[PDB]
Write a protein of this length. Structure first.
Length: 156
């Protein structure tokens, strides 16, 4: 149940409860909830403080579920740039594809997150193709997202 409580507090965005669990009860940030997930996997990605608190206490950033999804994929897809920056700062790989063949940059392109695409562009392998055979520049272009094309052409 420590893993369920920490996951639950993180998913609700309760920063004070997350601090209490980590710093007073001394729950390890990788404690598993009942469905085998860590708090970093199910957190409210808008709560940057929760991500950094977990990472400073030793959470593993590269955790991945069986669909190949890690916290960086979900942070990029949902547009939470401040949280993505803390994840990358603490060692999260942004070049690992999910089970759809998508990097975090492909997900941000699909959803139209311009600031995230800009951040990830000089960091990502832009020749990687997803299941549909598209590179991130080709996915932009298909969608007609000219601001994303403009950014990606600058990186190749």
């Amino acid at each position: 149940r420590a893993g369920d409580r920490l996951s639950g507090a993180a998913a609700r965005g309760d920063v004070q409860e997350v601090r209490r669990l980590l710093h007073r009860e001394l729950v390890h940030p990788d404690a598993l909830n009942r469905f085998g997930k860590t708090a970093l996997q199910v957190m409210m990605f808008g709560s940057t403080a929760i991500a950094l608190e977990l990472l400073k206490q030793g959470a593993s950033p590269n955790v991945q579920d069986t669909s190949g999804t890690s916290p960086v994929h979900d942070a990029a897809r949902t547009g939470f740039l401040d949280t993505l920056k803390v994840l990358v700062e603490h060692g999260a790989d942004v070049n690992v594809p999910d089970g759809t063949g998508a990097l975090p940059i492909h997900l941000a392109v699909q959803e139209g997150h311009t600031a995230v695409v800009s951040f990830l562009a000089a960091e990502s392998d832009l020749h990687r193709r997803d299941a549909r055979g598209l590179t991130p520049l080709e996915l932009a272009l298909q969608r007609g997202a000219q601001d994303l094309v403009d950014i990606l052409q600058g990186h190749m």
